[PDB]
Write a protein that binds this ligand. Structure first.
Ligand code: GDP
Ligand code: MN
Ligand code: MN
Ligand code: MN
Length: 620
């Protein structure tokens, strides 16, 4: 009810009907409409018609450009201040800090950013009231995972950015069919605003609405709410990806007995017609997308992509670990993507794809560093800064975090079961990162508990994913450091508890390093499609082949166990060398890290593995 006309936003709905929404969806929409005060409300139906008008609208506003060279591809150029997912502005709200992060022993926690309810209410009320003035509030009903899938979860994102709507249509299942599937069911509440109410008080750069100063990405697992303000870029605004599928989801999985992980999923078929599914957790910019879409160099081997970033996993009745990709597309880094590195990505992004902050060629194409493709005579390049760009300048023409947003269905090697609601059985889990020294090409864990320790001990050199710079080696256990939804110590115990499941078929756990370098700073391993040779060894090890040698850090391939034909010039000694001096140092850093960062919440079995690894090394 009401005594005036300030609560019924029906007159501002320009597509859809507040009446057709489930009760709790309407309250969520109208309540924030009253708080944010949008000029219009647009309930997305996910149709092609809506998508086409949205793109046309953004093209008329100067928000996106049409890439004439390709089929329905578009380029967005962001404010240079809003070009990446901001980890320092990402917080998780719980009544108790210990629910979100372990209480460090000495210093500040790297496993998460906790904020109290009281502090968040002050930050929230300082940002959102009236933040959508003069703008349209889009209502995105989206499903993470195939509709009707047992591991699928439904969310509603409210946003004032048509760029977010278009991207969410690619990255999720979005439209009217989700509302019908949701019914009166529970849903994750996602609220997003670029934080630029009209009239504008700060001139917009590149027609990119954003509020860097007030940027804040908040998670409230207890209330099932994601609240993001100030940024329109990727992980900050596509709330189903990191905020939902990893942070919120990891907490739900802990409660409900499954796993939400930062893992690609790929199926691999060998020359004998046997096919296995693998999952791999690498930190950002460490090769998940290249591995998941690999073009294998070994004849008779086939790699198929289920997903390249997020895996939701759960043991089924038979004891198999089943995984689904909850996403609907790929949001991959553009630079470095070439025909020789990731030809399957090139084939995917040639249509129905949105590019952000890559360079544009004069003939309506895209360009970026590492594309490894010559341009025709006369073709000029416009940088992501919307300026004439020559290869002689030091400015890269594409931002290092530039992106393509492409539908997964267009991947030529998309797995025929990538949308199966039952998921795919995982028989192996891979951990890895950028280690320039010490860590061999591949080793296999000695047990489940050691495997969990291997994931917890993961380290990798600073890349260009968050706001980290320089050449530093940091910890990123399970490749989840930016994404833990709850106490990491409890996360370890959750992983360890899977070994207690009856009839559980635990997958083998491997650790790979594509990035070891020699004394000259040159990669010892060619990588890319050649990684199929490493997958072949894992494949045989899962079948039980006696191809492993025992070392202090785990099992490594026997001599001549790796198919190295066609290479031969590879320095195998330095590539699999295990140095006592290096690993003595490695255990100590892991020890100091786990002791400080996990402290009282470190499971004993993890501490035992650390002690056991320290002992085996000391006997070298
Ligand atoms: N040396 C080497 N580099 C790689 C390999 N795979 C990927 N890369 C590089 O790592 C960067 C990011 O790769 P990407 O697949 O997007 O990583 P993701 O963010 O985990 O999906 C790209 O620029 C690639 O050139 C590899 O096997 N060897
Ligand atoms: Mn990722
Ligand atoms: Mn990627
Ligand atoms: Mn145990």
């Amino acid at each position: 009810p009401q005594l005036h006309n300030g609560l019924d936003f029906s007159a501002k709905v320009i597509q859809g009907s507040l009446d057709s929404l489930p009760q709790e969806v309407r309250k969520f929409v109208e309540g924030n409409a009253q708080l944010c005060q949008p000029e219009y409300i647009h309930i997305c139906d996910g149709s092609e018609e809506e998508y086409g008008r949205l793109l046309a609208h953004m093209q008329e506003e100067g928000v996106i450009r049409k890439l004439k060279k390709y089929d329905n591809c578009w380029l967005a150029l962001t404010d240079p201040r809003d070009v990446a997912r901001i980890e320092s502005k990402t917080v998780i709200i719980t009544q108790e800090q210990r629910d979100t992060v372990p209480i460090p022993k000495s210093g500040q926690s790297q496993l998460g950013r906790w904020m109290s309810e009281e502090d968040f209410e002050k930050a929230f009320n300082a940002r959102f009231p009236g933040c959508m003035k003069g703008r349209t509030m889009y209502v995105i009903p989206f499903s993470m995972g195939p509709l009707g899938s047992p591991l699928a979860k439904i969310g509603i994102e409210l946003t004032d950015s048509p760029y977010v709507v278009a991207s969410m249509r690619i990255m999720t299942r979005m439209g009217t069919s989700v509302l019908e599937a949701l019914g009166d069911g529970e849903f994750i509440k996602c609220l997003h605003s670029v934080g630029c109410p009209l009239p504008l008080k700060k001139p917009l750069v590149n027609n990119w609405a954003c509020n860097p100063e007030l940027t804040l990405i908040a998670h409230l697992p207890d209330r099932r709410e994601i609240i993001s303000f100030g940024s329109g870029y990727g992980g900050n605004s596509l709330l189903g990806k990191k905020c939902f599928a990893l942070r919120i989801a990891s907490r739900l999985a802990k409660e409900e007995g499954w796993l939400a992980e930062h893992m690609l999923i790929l199926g691999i078929t060998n020359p004998e017609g046997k096919k296995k599914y693998l999952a791999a957790a690498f930190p950002s910019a460490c090769g998940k997308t290249n591995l998941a879409m690999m073009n294998p160099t070994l004849p008779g081997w086939k790699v198929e992509c289920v997903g390249d970033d997020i895996a939701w996993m759960k043991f089924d009745a038979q004891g198999n670990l089943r995984a689904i990709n909850p996403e609907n597309g790929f949001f991959g880094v553009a630079p470095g993507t070439s025909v020789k590195t990731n030809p399957n990505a090139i084939k995917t992004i040639q249509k129905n794809t949105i590019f952000t902050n890559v360079a544009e060629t004069s003939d309506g194409g895209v360009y970026w560093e590492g594309i490894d493709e010559p341009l025709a005579p006369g073709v000029t390049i416009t940088s992501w800064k919307n300026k004439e760009w020559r290869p002689q300048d030091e400015e890269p023409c594409a931002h290092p975090n530039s992106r393509f947003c492409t539908p997964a269905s267009q991947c030529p090697i998309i797995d025929p079961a990538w949308e199966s609601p039952e998921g795919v059985p995982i028989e192996g889990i891979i951990f890895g990162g950028r280690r320039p020294a010490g860590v061999p090409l591949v080793y296999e864990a000695l047990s489940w508990q050691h495997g969990v320790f291997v994931g917890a001990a993961m380290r990798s050199e600073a890349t260009a994913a968050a706001e980290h710079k320089g050449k530093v080696i940091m910890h990123d256990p399970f490749a989840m450091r930016p994404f833990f939804g709850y106490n990491f110590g409890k996360y370890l115990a959750h992983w360890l508890s899977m070994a207690h499941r009856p009839a559980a078929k635990l997958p083998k756990i491997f650790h790979v390093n594509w990035f070891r370098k020699d004394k000259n700073g040159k990669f010892l391993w060619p990588g890319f499609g050649e990684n199929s040779r490493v997958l072949e060894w894992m494949f045989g090890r899962i079948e039980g082949e006696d191809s492993a040698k025992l070392t202090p850090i785990g099992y490594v391939p026997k001599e001549d166990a790796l198919n190295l034909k066609g290479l031969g010039d590879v320095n195998v000694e330095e590539l699999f060398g295990i140095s006592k001096e290096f690993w003595e140092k490695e255990v100590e850093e892991i020890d100091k890290y786990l002791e400080d960062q996990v402290n009282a919440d470190l499971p004993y079995e993890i501490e035992r593995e650390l002690r056991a690894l320290k002992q085996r090394i000391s006997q070298m």
